[PDB]
Protein backbone atom coordinates (compact mmCIF):
# COMPACT_ATOMS: atom_id res chain seq x y z
CA UNK A 1 0.00 0.00 0.00
CA UNK A 2 2.82 2.45 0.80
CA UNK A 3 4.63 2.01 -2.55
CA UNK A 4 7.72 0.60 -0.83
CA UNK A 5 8.80 -1.44 -3.87
CA UNK A 6 10.93 1.49 -5.12
CA UNK A 7 13.20 1.57 -2.05
CA UNK A 8 15.00 -1.73 -2.57
CA UNK A 9 15.52 -1.36 -6.33
CA UNK A 10 19.08 -1.69 -7.60
CA UNK A 11 19.93 0.71 -10.42
CA UNK A 12 22.98 1.28 -12.61
CA UNK A 13 24.22 4.47 -10.97
CA UNK A 14 27.09 4.67 -13.47
CA UNK A 15 24.77 6.24 -16.06
CA UNK A 16 23.22 9.73 -16.07
CA UNK A 17 19.70 10.23 -14.76
CA UNK A 18 18.03 10.04 -18.17
CA UNK A 19 20.14 7.05 -19.20
CA UNK A 20 19.52 5.34 -15.86
CA UNK A 21 16.37 3.31 -15.30
CA UNK A 22 13.33 5.47 -14.55
CA UNK A 23 11.67 4.02 -11.44
CA UNK A 24 8.04 4.39 -12.45
CA UNK A 25 5.64 2.71 -10.05
CA UNK A 26 4.18 0.41 -12.71
CA UNK A 27 7.63 -0.51 -14.02
CA UNK A 28 9.08 -1.05 -10.54
CA UNK A 29 6.11 -3.27 -9.68
CA UNK A 30 6.55 -5.18 -12.95
CA UNK A 31 10.24 -5.76 -12.28
CA UNK A 32 9.50 -7.00 -8.77
CA UNK A 33 6.78 -9.27 -10.17
CA UNK A 34 9.10 -10.72 -12.82
CA UNK A 35 11.79 -11.39 -10.23
CA UNK A 36 9.29 -13.03 -7.89
CA UNK A 37 7.97 -15.18 -10.74
CA UNK A 38 11.49 -16.35 -11.58
CA UNK A 39 12.30 -16.95 -7.91
CA UNK A 40 9.17 -19.08 -7.51
CA UNK A 41 10.31 -21.57 -10.18
CA UNK A 42 13.62 -22.29 -8.45
CA UNK A 43 13.26 -24.31 -5.23
CA UNK A 44 14.64 -22.44 -2.23
CA UNK A 45 16.90 -25.37 -1.23
CA UNK A 46 18.45 -26.52 -4.52
CA UNK A 47 19.55 -22.92 -5.17
CA UNK A 48 18.66 -19.34 -4.30
CA UNK A 49 18.37 -16.00 -6.10
CA UNK A 50 18.59 -12.87 -3.94
CA UNK A 51 16.96 -9.63 -5.03
CA UNK A 52 19.72 -7.24 -3.95
CA UNK A 53 22.28 -9.16 -6.03
CA UNK A 54 20.16 -8.74 -9.16
CA UNK A 55 19.17 -6.13 -11.72
CA UNK A 56 15.78 -5.96 -13.43
CA UNK A 57 15.50 -3.37 -16.20
CA UNK A 58 12.30 -2.78 -18.16
CA UNK A 59 11.95 -0.89 -21.43
CA UNK A 60 8.46 0.55 -21.85
CA UNK A 61 6.78 3.83 -22.80
CA UNK A 62 8.37 5.61 -19.84
CA UNK A 63 11.81 3.98 -20.02
CA UNK A 64 13.62 4.65 -23.33
CA UNK A 65 16.78 2.71 -22.41
CA UNK A 66 17.33 -0.98 -21.68
CA UNK A 67 20.13 -1.42 -19.14
CA UNK A 68 21.98 -4.69 -18.63
CA UNK A 69 25.32 -6.00 -17.43
CA UNK A 70 27.23 -9.09 -18.52
CA UNK A 71 30.86 -10.21 -18.69
CA UNK A 72 31.98 -7.03 -16.96
CA UNK A 73 30.21 -4.85 -19.54
CA UNK A 74 27.60 -2.31 -18.47
CA UNK A 75 25.54 -1.91 -21.64
CA UNK A 76 22.60 0.34 -22.47
CA UNK A 77 20.43 -0.06 -25.56
CA UNK A 78 18.60 2.99 -26.94
CA UNK A 79 16.19 2.27 -29.81
CA UNK A 80 16.48 4.74 -32.66
CA UNK A 81 12.69 4.91 -33.02
CA UNK A 82 11.94 7.00 -29.93
CA UNK A 83 14.82 8.97 -28.39
CA UNK A 84 17.69 9.00 -30.90
CA UNK A 85 17.97 12.52 -32.32
CA UNK A 86 21.35 11.71 -33.90
CA UNK A 87 22.74 8.31 -34.92
CA UNK A 88 26.31 9.56 -34.71
CA UNK A 89 29.38 7.46 -35.50
CA UNK A 90 32.39 9.28 -34.00
CA UNK A 91 31.75 7.89 -30.51
CA UNK A 92 33.65 4.59 -30.54
CA UNK A 93 31.88 3.23 -27.45
CA UNK A 94 28.78 2.88 -29.62
CA UNK A 95 27.76 -0.39 -31.26
CA UNK A 96 25.57 0.47 -34.25
CA UNK A 97 23.13 -2.39 -33.80
CA UNK A 98 21.58 -3.34 -37.14
CA UNK A 99 18.45 -5.36 -37.78
CA UNK A 100 18.97 -8.48 -39.88
CA UNK A 101 15.84 -7.77 -41.98
CA UNK A 102 15.51 -3.99 -42.35
CA UNK A 103 19.33 -3.69 -42.34
CA UNK A 104 18.90 -0.32 -40.60
CA UNK A 105 20.28 1.29 -37.45
CA UNK A 106 17.32 0.41 -35.26
CA UNK A 107 19.23 0.54 -31.97
CA UNK A 108 22.30 2.18 -30.45
CA UNK A 109 24.43 0.29 -27.93
CA UNK A 110 26.41 2.30 -25.37
CA UNK A 111 29.15 0.35 -23.60
CA UNK A 112 30.84 0.91 -20.26
CA UNK A 113 33.36 -0.91 -18.10
CA UNK A 114 31.66 -2.42 -15.06
CA UNK A 115 32.51 -1.02 -11.64
CA UNK A 116 33.47 -4.49 -10.41
CA UNK A 117 35.99 -4.82 -13.24
CA UNK A 118 37.50 -1.43 -12.38
CA UNK A 119 37.72 -2.47 -8.72
CA UNK A 120 39.41 -5.74 -9.71
CA UNK A 121 41.92 -3.91 -11.90
CA UNK A 122 42.70 -1.43 -9.13
CA UNK A 123 43.13 -4.32 -6.68
CA UNK A 124 45.48 -6.09 -9.10
CA UNK A 125 47.60 -2.96 -9.50
CA UNK A 126 47.58 -2.42 -5.73
CA UNK A 127 48.79 -5.96 -5.05
CA UNK A 128 51.41 -5.57 -7.79
CA UNK A 129 52.73 -2.43 -6.11
CA UNK A 130 52.54 -3.52 -2.47
CA UNK A 131 54.28 -6.81 -3.31
CA UNK A 132 57.34 -4.99 -4.61
CA UNK A 133 59.58 -4.49 -1.57
CA UNK A 134 62.13 -6.98 -2.93
CA UNK A 135 61.35 -7.25 -6.64
CA UNK A 136 63.08 -6.25 -9.86
CA UNK A 137 61.74 -3.25 -11.76
CA UNK A 138 61.34 -5.34 -14.91
CA UNK A 139 59.07 -7.81 -13.09
CA UNK A 140 56.84 -4.97 -11.89
CA UNK A 141 56.68 -3.40 -15.34
CA UNK A 142 55.89 -6.77 -16.95
CA UNK A 143 53.08 -7.42 -14.46
CA UNK A 144 51.65 -3.96 -15.11
CA UNK A 145 51.92 -4.48 -18.88
CA UNK A 146 50.14 -7.83 -18.67
CA UNK A 147 47.33 -6.38 -16.57
CA UNK A 148 46.98 -3.41 -18.91
CA UNK A 149 46.82 -5.48 -22.10
CA UNK A 150 44.30 -7.83 -20.51
CA UNK A 151 42.06 -4.96 -19.47
CA UNK A 152 42.37 -3.02 -22.72
CA UNK A 153 41.90 -5.99 -25.05
CA UNK A 154 38.99 -7.36 -23.03
CA UNK A 155 37.31 -3.97 -22.51
CA UNK A 156 38.10 -2.25 -25.80
CA UNK A 157 35.36 0.20 -26.90
CA UNK A 158 34.30 0.23 -23.24
CA UNK A 159 37.20 2.30 -21.92
CA UNK A 160 36.27 5.35 -24.00
CA UNK A 161 32.92 5.83 -22.27
CA UNK A 162 34.32 5.08 -18.79
CA UNK A 163 36.22 8.26 -17.99
CA UNK A 164 36.66 6.96 -14.45
CA UNK A 165 38.56 4.04 -15.97
CA UNK A 166 40.83 6.43 -17.87
CA UNK A 167 41.55 8.31 -14.65
CA UNK A 168 42.21 5.06 -12.79
CA UNK A 169 44.51 3.84 -15.58
CA UNK A 170 46.63 6.98 -15.63
CA UNK A 171 46.68 7.05 -11.82
CA UNK A 172 47.92 3.45 -11.65
CA UNK A 173 50.53 4.13 -14.33
CA UNK A 174 51.76 7.09 -12.27
CA UNK A 175 51.81 4.78 -9.24
CA UNK A 176 54.03 2.32 -11.10
CA UNK A 177 56.35 5.09 -12.28
CA UNK A 178 56.56 6.50 -8.75
CA UNK A 179 57.40 3.07 -7.35
CA UNK A 180 60.18 2.61 -9.91
CA UNK A 181 61.55 6.10 -9.24
CA UNK A 182 61.56 5.45 -5.49
CA UNK A 183 63.36 2.19 -6.23
CA UNK A 184 66.07 4.06 -8.14
CA UNK A 185 66.62 6.82 -5.57
CA UNK A 186 64.89 7.59 -2.28
CA UNK A 187 63.84 11.03 -3.54
CA UNK A 188 61.28 12.14 -6.10
CA UNK A 189 62.77 13.40 -9.38
CA UNK A 190 61.62 16.84 -10.45
CA UNK A 191 61.83 16.51 -14.25
CA UNK A 192 62.11 12.77 -14.81
CA UNK A 193 62.10 11.79 -18.50
CA UNK A 194 59.81 9.15 -20.04
CA UNK A 195 62.56 7.49 -22.12
Amino acid sequence: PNNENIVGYNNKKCWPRDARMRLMKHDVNLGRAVFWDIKNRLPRSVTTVQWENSFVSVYSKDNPNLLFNMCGFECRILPKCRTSYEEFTHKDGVWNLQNEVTKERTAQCFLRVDDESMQRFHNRVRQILMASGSTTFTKIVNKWNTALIGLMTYFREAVVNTQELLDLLVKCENKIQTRIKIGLNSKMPSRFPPV
Partner: peptide, 22 residues
Protein backbone atom coordinates in the same frame (compact mmCIF):
# COMPACT_ATOMS: atom_id res chain seq x y z
CA UNK B 1 57.94 18.05 -19.54
CA UNK B 2 57.11 17.21 -15.93
CA UNK B 3 57.41 13.46 -16.52
CA UNK B 4 53.98 12.75 -15.04
CA UNK B 5 51.31 10.79 -16.91
CA UNK B 6 48.35 12.94 -17.95
CA UNK B 7 44.79 11.66 -18.14
CA UNK B 8 43.51 11.69 -21.72
CA UNK B 9 39.91 12.34 -20.68
CA UNK B 10 38.69 15.16 -22.88
CA UNK B 11 41.64 14.55 -25.19
CA UNK B 12 42.41 13.14 -28.66
CA UNK B 13 38.77 12.68 -29.64
CA UNK B 14 39.77 13.46 -33.22
CA UNK B 15 41.25 9.96 -33.48
CA UNK B 16 39.53 6.59 -33.66
CA UNK B 17 40.82 3.28 -32.27
CA UNK B 18 41.36 1.52 -35.60
CA UNK B 19 43.72 4.23 -36.83
CA UNK B 20 47.51 3.86 -36.82
CA UNK B 21 47.09 0.12 -37.36
CA UNK B 22 47.15 -1.87 -40.59
Amino acid sequence: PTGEVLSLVGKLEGTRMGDKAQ
